[PDB]
Design a protein around this motif. Structure first.
Motif, PDB file in Angstrom:
ATOM      1  N   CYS B 106     -35.343 130.968  81.379  1.00  0.00           N
ATOM      2  CA  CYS B 106     -33.800 130.798  80.888  1.00  0.00           C
ATOM      3  C   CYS B 106     -34.663 132.849  80.331  1.00  0.00           C
ATOM      4  O   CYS B 106     -35.290 132.955  79.743  1.00  0.00           O
ATOM      5  N   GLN B 107     -33.185 133.389  80.352  1.00  0.00           N
ATOM      6  CA  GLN B 107     -33.451 134.854  80.350  1.00  0.00           C
ATOM      7  C   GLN B 107     -33.422 135.076  78.575  1.00  0.00           C
ATOM      8  O   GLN B 107     -34.163 136.094  77.874  1.00  0.00           O
ATOM      9  N   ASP B 108     -32.695 134.319  77.823  1.00  0.00           N
ATOM     10  CA  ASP B 108     -32.993 134.190  76.476  1.00  0.00           C
ATOM     11  C   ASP B 108     -33.985 133.672  76.185  1.00  0.00           C
ATOM     12  O   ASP B 108     -33.369 131.663  76.104  1.00  0.00           O
ATOM     13  N   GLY B 187     -31.887 128.303  72.059  1.00  0.00           N
ATOM     14  CA  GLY B 187     -31.054 129.156  73.048  1.00  0.00           C
ATOM     15  C   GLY B 187     -29.575 129.772  72.104  1.00  0.00           C
ATOM     16  O   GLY B 187     -29.383 129.238  71.556  1.00  0.00           O
ATOM     17  N   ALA B 224     -22.362 126.644  76.805  1.00  0.00           N
ATOM     18  CA  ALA B 224     -22.998 126.552  76.546  1.00  0.00           C
ATOM     19  C   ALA B 224     -24.191 125.900  77.961  1.00  0.00           C
ATOM     20  O   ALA B 224     -25.267 124.872  77.711  1.00  0.00           O
ATOM     21  N   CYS B 225     -23.903 126.271  78.636  1.00  0.00           N
ATOM     22  CA  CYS B 225     -24.970 126.089  80.510  1.00  0.00           C
ATOM     23  C   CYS B 225     -25.009 124.654  80.425  1.00  0.00           C
ATOM     24  O   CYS B 225     -26.035 124.130  80.571  1.00  0.00           O
ATOM     25  N   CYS B 319     -28.995 122.638  75.749  1.00  0.00           N
ATOM     26  CA  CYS B 319     -27.985 122.982  76.706  1.00  0.00           C
ATOM     27  C   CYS B 319     -29.086 122.615  78.669  1.00  0.00           C
ATOM     28  O   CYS B 319     -30.022 122.238  78.268  1.00  0.00           O
ATOM     29  N   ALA B 321     -31.537 125.384  78.940  1.00  0.00           N
ATOM     30  CA  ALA B 321     -32.687 125.791  78.751  1.00  0.00           C
ATOM     31  C   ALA B 321     -32.706 125.101  77.565  1.00  0.00           C
ATOM     32  O   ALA B 321     -32.989 125.543  76.028  1.00  0.00           O
ATOM     33  N   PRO B 430     -26.786 135.065  82.846  1.00  0.00           N
ATOM     34  CA  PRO B 430     -25.595 135.195  82.151  1.00  0.00           C
ATOM     35  C   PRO B 430     -25.483 135.121  81.111  1.00  0.00           C
ATOM     36  O   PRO B 430     -25.679 133.790  80.418  1.00  0.00           O
ATOM     37  N   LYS B 455     -21.207 133.939  82.360  1.00  0.00           N
ATOM     38  CA  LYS B 455     -21.228 131.976  82.715  1.00  0.00           C
ATOM     39  C   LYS B 455     -19.823 131.517  81.033  1.00  0.00           C
ATOM     40  O   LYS B 455     -19.706 132.049  80.136  1.00  0.00           O
TER      41      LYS B 455
HETATM   42  S1  SF4 Z   1     -26.980 128.500  76.798  1.00  0.00           S
HETATM   43 FE1  SF4 Z   1     -27.357 128.957  78.762  1.00  0.00          FE
HETATM   44  S2  SF4 Z   1     -27.933 131.364  78.695  1.00  0.00           S
HETATM   45 FE2  SF4 Z   1     -27.654 130.150  76.549  1.00  0.00          FE
HETATM   46  S3  SF4 Z   1     -30.372 129.382  76.415  1.00  0.00           S
HETATM   47 FE3  SF4 Z   1     -28.567 127.407  76.785  1.00  0.00          FE
HETATM   48  S4  SF4 Z   1     -29.835 127.886  79.485  1.00  0.00           S
HETATM   49 FE4  SF4 Z   1     -29.292 129.770  79.034  1.00  0.00          FE
END
Ligand code: SF4
Ligand code: JYD
Ligand code: JYD
Ligand code: SF4
Lengths: 531, 532
Positions: B106-108, B187, B224-225, B319, B321, B430, B455
């Motif tokens: 994840c980017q985060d 995250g 939160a995905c 999440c 991630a 996102p 998202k």
């Molecule tokens: S909530 Fe979504 S964007 Fe944020 S860390 Fe978890 S997977 Fe990555």
């Protein structure tokens, strides 16, 4: 390029600003040694038992200066309301009785919380939790305190543990060879006023933050016995870290933090926003429980780093039963924070006969507006959370509302243990709002027309009292020892004795003070300040 | 008589059920000694740096089996919706890319959290926080991760710390001579879905608790995905203890607790109410982000003792991630939990939208389709999230116009991780849309932000804004940052506010970028039934 920066950098990490007394002879429990070239401390774990016992004994009978000074300020301030001074005087007189070491200052002797910091080279044998718990057990068993902890046998079946265990034991690993502690006897209702908000960058501007503070302070209401020590934490690395920080802030544990931030994200106290919190508290008019200026003793605001996506916010109070005590063990023995043992130096109505049919009591109360002070004389039936739940369940199964809910005002309370030769242990009121979901139901079934407790209540209770001709009377919140000493003359367990302090009681009282908070006409003493 | 009962009594306190790998040669960092008749362990604090660096490197490229199995379940279950299967397949393919050890999943890359348990006779020299922080610093500095921590210079003035410090370092004093750890790369958006409720005895009956669970799970939404690991904690000795417990429960740290209570108030896992939480999650229809059955991977419910006057309740998620790793240091060296290096073993219709057109023509095309339509975006996105939105609003409050670059392209809420050498983009999925809701009507009234891409479900004000102004909200899949970077993001340039780091305004070019129309220009919302 790497630079380590601890989040918390107090200028007084060992709390040198606090005065401590040494437990006499306690040097026998410690021995300084030198191992692999470093200074270490051997600690007999019995020292942990001795320390926890004294801490959770002392803290129920004495207060800190900044707390007592706040009550004196509410009495001496010309801008304080009459009710401000009345509540503060009552709480100071309660503290004078508690200082006799027999009755605890509040009937809710709280959850036992231990924050411990054991040095790398402080060697106890490792059974710290057991030995601390034994000291806590001793304090609650052999003194006139209360067993307040509720064990879950399954998700819904509960029983009192009968000893105020388990404690919350947060023992941290730190540098050095000492053992440093903060002991907290945390009241349940003030613990309930620890709130977590998940906010955003949109909050972080002066106008939005001010409005947020005004809104959230009102949600504290009077349900945790103000004047409050108000703590506000903006930011944090996690919800649990934010809530730990706001707890410690309310105990004035972080008073020596820096007052400016830096590019490494260190925590800091914000005096400018503490003053704003106090301005909001004073201008709210909520006052020391019944309208006025003294909603708050003082405020602590801590700003924390945050993940860019996150802004947790914590709000919490320390209540009138402001109970914490710092301590440490070192090469010289056991040291415990010295509280004020002479609180007396800080000191500068409609008679209602309950010995009548309840309809006659209702008729008398209907003659007066909300805000009227009353003095109750006669029988009260005592019932709180579990008793109300059991009575609702009985009625849901077709059984009648019990006779004892229909004869007398219902006092929401649970007593501490009775001292030998006393009529009653400490026996002040329980937070009324937790019983709100029962009032319309019980009144619709012919009972609970008059309730007596502390704290503002929800609109459903105002509506119920108007529909059914009921009343809610607000006792002063907190003065449990003076109520027991002066007002409560007889105590009997009426029903559900297995519930311990949450049993139904029948008590006989004299000169029991209260305010009419909700009348039988749709009026609420808190409708202006807590709208 | 006195009987001590620890609140937490796991049957597997050292996590023997977890597979660990030894860091080769790491026994050189420890030495067994005996003082005062007791066994002690001298630990070179460099071991803490080595361990933290490996932990916060491994955790961004690999997942646990129970997480991967949950995605496979969402693909293979006949009761999974088509969107459930699509989302889970995307997340598994993302994990396969992340397993290449270049792009993080994840980017985060999260907040660095360390739960440490140092034995009484485990002697490190005492500088644990500094040495752990150095290892974390190494992991985020020398790998393609992201600096996500925001320092407060005063109450409102902020800057990025530029190194993802400070970490949260919770180091506990425990018996023995070992050092045990749980490392979490948490995250931000899932940390935001950690909720505290102050409840009462009136909640503690089957009907009330079931209704409570149904109500509160909906407030998690898709922000939160999901699929989520859902954790619920009933009771606790304080708010902070409840919230710590619900965090650890979501990391499956308490899986070996007893399953019954006792008269001493011990904590227990409640399998019956875990099953009820899962039934509520499945029947909600919220699904794995876009409607269906797979709102949740699994559930953990922990019942705690409480003061008679109190009933704190914690609700939290892990999440997509899902990033934690157990570890320990003992007389044999440094051991770290082994994650799944081969996620590929778990692997078993759209409208093309050209963004290289006038924005009004893109709006006209999107207006032809109902909410729930899957689109594939090709063209320019302008990227802006929390701080850029706040700065632009502040400019407008000072009389300045909405910048022209907010009016030319759809707005992608995102903040990229660092770019690998030779790559067009670092991980770049996102941001949670809901945090920008207060800006949409304002920006649309000034001629921009007509199309947003992010998202999560959004509030009613955004639905109303899009109907008033002829706007749209497009939902990207949440979580698949590595596959988006590898396959969809073709060029990244900084357009404004470079001082904000990852929160700068970017101009990016994308191809085959998948999304769903979540809010249209007619008052419709893909989540209006499941998240009402
Ligand atoms: S909530 Fe979504 S964007 Fe944020 S860390 Fe978890 S997977 Fe990555
Ligand atoms: O437990 C008590 O007696 C006081 C607490 S503050 C309450 O009931 O709300
Ligand atoms: O920071 C990110 O990129 C993801 C988090 S979950 C967010 O912004 O909502
Ligand atoms: S002072 Fe009030 S809030 Fe505090 S413990 Fe006593 S009754 Fe509860």
């Amino acid at each position: 390029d790497f630079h380590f920066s601890a989040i918390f950098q107090p200028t007084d990490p060992h709390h040198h600003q606090t005065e401590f007394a040494k437990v006499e002879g306690s040097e026998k429990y410690v021995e300084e040694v030198e191992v692999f070239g470093r200074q270490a401390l051997k600690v007999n774990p019995e020292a942990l038992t001795i320390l926890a016992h004294r801490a959770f004994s002392d803290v129920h009978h004495f207060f800190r200066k900044d707390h007592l000074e706040g009550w004196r300020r509410a009495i001496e301030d010309p801008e304080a309301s009459d009710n401000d001074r009345y509540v503060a005087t009552t709480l100071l007189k309660n503290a004078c009785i508690a200082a006799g070491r027999v009755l605890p200052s509040c009937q809710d002797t709280g959850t036992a919380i231990v924050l411990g910091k054991r040095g790398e080279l402080c060697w106890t044998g490792g059974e710290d939790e057991k030995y601390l718990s034994k000291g806590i057990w001793n304090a609650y068993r052999y003194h006139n305190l209360r067993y307040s902890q509720t064990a879950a046998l399954d998700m819904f079946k509960e029983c009192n543990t009968g000893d105020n265990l388990p404690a919350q034991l947060d023992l941290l690993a730190v540098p050095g060879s000492d053992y440093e502690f903060l002991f907290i006897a945390k009241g349940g209702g003030s613990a309930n006023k620890a709130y977590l908000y998940q906010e955003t960058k949109a909050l972080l501007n002066p106008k939005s933050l001010r409005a947020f503070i005004e809104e959230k302070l009102k949600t504290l209401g009077t349900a945790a016995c103000p004047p409050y020590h108000i703590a506000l934490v903006i930011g944090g690395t996690s919800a649990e870290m934010t809530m730990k920080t706001v707890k410690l802030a309310s105990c004035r544990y972080y008073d020596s933090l820096p007052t400016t931030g830096d590019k490494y994200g260190r925590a800091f106290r914000d005096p400018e926003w503490e003053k704003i919190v106090m301005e909001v508290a004073q201008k709210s008019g909520i006052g020391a429980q019944f309208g006025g200026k003294y909603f708050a003793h003082q405020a602590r605001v801590i700003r924390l780093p945050r993940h860019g996506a996150s802004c947790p916010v914590g709000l919490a109070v320390s209540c009138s039963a402001d109970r914490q005590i710092l301590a440490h063990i070192n090469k010289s023995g056991i040291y415990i924070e010295q509280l004020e043992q002479n609180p007396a130096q800080y000191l500068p109505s409609v008679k209602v006969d309950l010995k009548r049919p309840i309809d006659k009591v209702r008729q008398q109360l209907s003659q007066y507006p909300v805000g009227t002070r009353v003095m109750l004389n006669g029988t009260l039936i005592v019932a709180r959370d579990i008793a109300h739940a059991k009575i609702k369940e009985m009625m849901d199964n077709g059984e009648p509302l019990p006779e004892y809910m229909k004869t007398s005002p219902i006092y929401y309370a649970g007593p501490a243990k009775t001292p030998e030769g006393y009529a009653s242990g400490s026996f002040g009121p329980t937070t009324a709002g937790r019983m709100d979901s029962y009032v319309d139901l019980f009144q619709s079934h012919g009972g609970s027309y008059i309730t007596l407790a502390k704290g503002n209540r929800s609109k459903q209770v105002t509506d119920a009292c108007k529909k059914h001709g009921g009343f809610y009377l607000g006792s002063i919140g907190g003065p449990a020892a003076i109520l027991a000493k002066d007002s409560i003359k007889q105590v009997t367990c009426l029903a559900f004795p297995e519930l311990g302090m949450e049993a139904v009681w029948k008590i006989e009282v004299e000169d029991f003070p209260a305010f009419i908070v909700v009348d039988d006409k749709g009026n609420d003493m808190y409708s202006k300040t807590l709208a």
